[PDB]
Amino acid sequence: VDFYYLPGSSPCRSVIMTAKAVGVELNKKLLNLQAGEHLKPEFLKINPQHTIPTLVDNGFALWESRAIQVYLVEKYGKTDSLYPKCPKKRAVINQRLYFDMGTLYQSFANYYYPQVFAKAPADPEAFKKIEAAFEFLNTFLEGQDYAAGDSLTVADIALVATVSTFEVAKFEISKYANVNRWYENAKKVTPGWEENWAGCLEFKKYFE
Amino acid sequence: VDFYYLPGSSPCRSVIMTAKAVGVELNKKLLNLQAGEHLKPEFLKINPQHTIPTLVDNGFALWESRAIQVYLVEKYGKTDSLYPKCPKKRAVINQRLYFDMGTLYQSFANYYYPQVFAKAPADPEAFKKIEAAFEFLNTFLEGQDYAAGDSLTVADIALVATVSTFEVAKFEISKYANVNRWYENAKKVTPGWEENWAGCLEFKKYFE
Ligand SMILES: N[C@@H](CCC(=O)N[C@@H](CS)C(=O)NCC(=O)O)C(=O)O
Ligand SMILES: N[C@@H](CCC(=O)N[C@@H](CS)C(=O)NCC(=O)O)C(=O)O
């Protein structure tokens, strides 16, 4: 199983943690985006959208971190604990994964990307959207130890990648008591957390 | 099965078309966002994120259109044709669903939302991102009749909702030959297309 990635990338880190939780060995292949390695003809043949993470599993090329997370559990999971067979349980996890992409991580990207990639002035209005996203996550987590069911699922792992990216960006996570509680527990129980944090500290370099 | 929605909403229309394809009757409940009906305590108890579409199915409250699409197929589909059992086939569909949210529809939102909701001047740079997204979709569709497998799947239905929203926004879809071919076929084969187009024409009012 080939894994094209960079350690700093949040979506790459979600896959690293998921693969570790599942117990599937990844052949880790650094793909240097700063060098344009993703844009070379050889990579475009694998992933024409030229994004990381990209997985190649026995001829099957797959991208989108959250699709990769689910695929790894479905194909390699000894049990379905991280992504249960029940359509209802799956739907909650799926909703949280779409929340993670389209609301939570989207708020990260909308606010921090223009600053770190375009060197633009921070938009205090986009910051309000981050706060809104955390407020929703906080409400989801009321009375709940995990984000999308009774135990750890791919939804938690995805959110851990995102929230840890916010931590290294110096966002005040502690203001959201349920998020903070969930997050601190998640660090202790999520396989691959240390490698994720190494990646977060790598990404921090964009804030220097 | 209760369905809180507005006909103009792209994510609502994906669910309408999916429910029709599956053959599941929806109790359609208009939720007037302009009135703030989604923000009332009674709705927040169902969906604390106050978004449409929201489904309530026998006590189970679910939001995120793409999660709802999959759930309807998993629970109600007579066959799994729209969302096959195979993890590999599912993964391709899942990747296309994340593409639809985070790349294609995101480009719509980034460009048109500030104009139609904030009355801001169009950003020609955000327009370039729409073109980029369509270029990726065009490449995905090379030699393919459907977006994510040999037959129509929830991925096509999601993309139909999005691309039809671009059509009513007057985006030049015909410039992307594979997208145009796929889209025109999709109109003919996708259950609920006419109701989707009615909704698109409703949304057009935001461009008056
Ligand atoms: N929605 C995608 C996002 C992928 C993504 O943001 N990858 C970035 C690096 S973190 C990338 O490959 N950028 C290079 C490019 O798009 O050309 C996912 O979750 O995997
Ligand atoms: N990612 C969500 C998007 C939901 C969405 O954009 N809904 C809008 C209307 S089209 C909404 O409920 N806005 C009201 C709000 O967020 O307060 C999905 O696919 O369902």
Side-chain angles (χ1 to χ4, degrees):
Chain A
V1 183
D2 290 345
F3 177 61
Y4 296 86
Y5 83 116
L6 287 175
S9 168
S10 191
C12 293
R13 287 177 272 116
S14 60
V15 176
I16 290 164
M17 288 184 282
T18 307
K20 284 269 212 199
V22 167
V24 54
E25 182 73 21
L26 299 178
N27 173 22
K28 295 206 286 187
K29 297 185 78 160
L30 286 172
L31 191 64
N32 191 330
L33 309 188
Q34 301 210 300
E37 296 191 335
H38 63 306
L39 302 169
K40 296 174 154 181
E42 308 95 297
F43 191 75
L44 298 174
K45 193 169 169 192
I46 300 182
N47 177 0
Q49 197 178 349
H50 52 85
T51 56
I52 59 171
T54 292
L55 194 83
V56 179
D57 180 346
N58 283 106
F60 177 47
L62 177 66
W63 55 101
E64 285 296 344
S65 58
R66 298 167 191 83
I68 295 168
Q69 288 186 88
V70 165
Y71 174 75
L72 292 180
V73 176
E74 292 201 293
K75 188 179 177 170
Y76 298 100
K78 293 310 180 72
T79 70
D80 65 354
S81 191
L82 292 164
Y83 198 67
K85 284 164 207 182
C86 183
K88 175 167 172 189
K89 291 180 185 196
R90 286 177 179 159
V92 183
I93 293 161
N94 289 160
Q95 180 259 130
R96 255 56 149 165
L97 293 172
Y98 291 111
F99 175 83
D100 175 68
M101 168 183 268
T103 303
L104 190 67
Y105 196 83
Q106 197 60 45
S107 70
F108 187 98
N110 288 352
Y111 183 67
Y112 295 106
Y113 281 19
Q115 301 184 72
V116 301
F117 299 131
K119 310 300 206 187
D123 187 343
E125 287 316 302
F127 190 75
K128 290 197 203 162
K129 288 295 173 181
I130 292 170
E131 293 180 307
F134 267 83
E135 201 58 65
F136 292 135
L137 183 56
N138 197 73
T139 295
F140 300 163
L141 287 166
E142 186 60 55
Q144 294 295 304
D145 289 341
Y146 297 97
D150 287 344
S151 59
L152 188 86
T153 62
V154 290
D156 297 281
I157 299 176
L159 289 164
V160 168
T162 299
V163 173
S164 67
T165 310
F166 276 106
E167 189 184 347
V168 84
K170 303 177 177 190
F171 181 79
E172 191 197 348
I173 300 162
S174 69
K175 184 168 173 280
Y176 305 88
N178 296 148
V179 185
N180 189 77
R181 166 195 44 76
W182 160 87
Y183 181 45
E184 294 297 319
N185 175 250
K187 293 179 186 179
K188 298 194 168 69
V189 306
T190 304
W193 164 260
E194 311 294 339
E195 179 169 1
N196 172 75
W197 188 247
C200 287
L201 295 176
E202 180 55 33
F203 181 65
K204 189 176 68 71
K205 292 167 173 174
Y206 280 95
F207 297 98
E208 290 169 348
Chain B
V1 183
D2 290 345
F3 177 61
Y4 296 86
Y5 83 116
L6 287 175
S9 168
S10 191
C12 293
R13 287 177 272 116
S14 60
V15 176
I16 290 164
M17 288 184 282
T18 307
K20 284 269 212 199
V22 167
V24 54
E25 182 73 21
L26 299 178
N27 173 22
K28 295 206 286 187
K29 297 185 78 160
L30 286 172
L31 191 64
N32 191 330
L33 309 188
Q34 301 210 300
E37 296 191 335
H38 63 306
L39 302 169
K40 296 174 154 181
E42 308 95 297
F43 191 75
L44 298 174
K45 193 169 169 192
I46 300 182
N47 177 0
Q49 197 178 349
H50 52 85
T51 56
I52 59 171
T54 292
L55 194 83
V56 179
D57 180 346
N58 283 106
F60 177 47
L62 177 66
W63 55 101
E64 285 296 344
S65 58
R66 298 167 191 83
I68 295 168
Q69 288 186 88
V70 165
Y71 174 75
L72 292 180
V73 176
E74 292 201 293
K75 188 179 177 170
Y76 298 100
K78 293 310 180 72
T79 70
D80 65 354
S81 191
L82 292 164
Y83 198 67
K85 284 164 207 182
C86 183
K88 175 167 172 189
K89 291 180 185 196
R90 286 177 179 159
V92 183
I93 293 161
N94 289 160
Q95 180 259 130
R96 255 56 149 165
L97 293 172
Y98 291 111
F99 175 83
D100 175 68
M101 168 183 268
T103 303
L104 190 67
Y105 196 83
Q106 197 60 45
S107 70
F108 187 98
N110 288 352
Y111 183 67
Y112 295 106
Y113 281 19
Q115 301 184 72
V116 301
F117 299 131
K119 310 300 206 187
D123 187 343
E125 287 316 302
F127 190 75
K128 290 197 203 162
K129 288 295 173 181
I130 292 170
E131 293 180 307
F134 267 83
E135 201 58 65
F136 292 135
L137 183 56
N138 197 73
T139 295
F140 300 163
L141 287 166
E142 186 60 55
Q144 294 295 304
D145 289 341
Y146 297 97
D150 287 344
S151 59
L152 188 86
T153 62
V154 290
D156 297 281
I157 299 176
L159 289 164
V160 168
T162 299
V163 173
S164 67
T165 310
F166 276 106
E167 189 184 347
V168 84
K170 303 177 177 190
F171 181 79
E172 191 197 348
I173 300 162
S174 69
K175 184 168 173 280
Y176 305 88
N178 296 148
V179 185
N180 189 77
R181 166 195 44 76
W182 160 87
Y183 181 45
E184 294 297 319
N185 175 250
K187 293 179 186 179
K188 298 194 168 69
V189 306
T190 304
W193 164 260
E194 311 294 339
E195 179 169 1
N196 172 75
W197 188 247
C200 287
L201 295 176
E202 180 55 33
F203 181 65
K204 189 176 68 71
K205 292 167 173 174
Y206 280 95
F207 297 98
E208 290 169 348

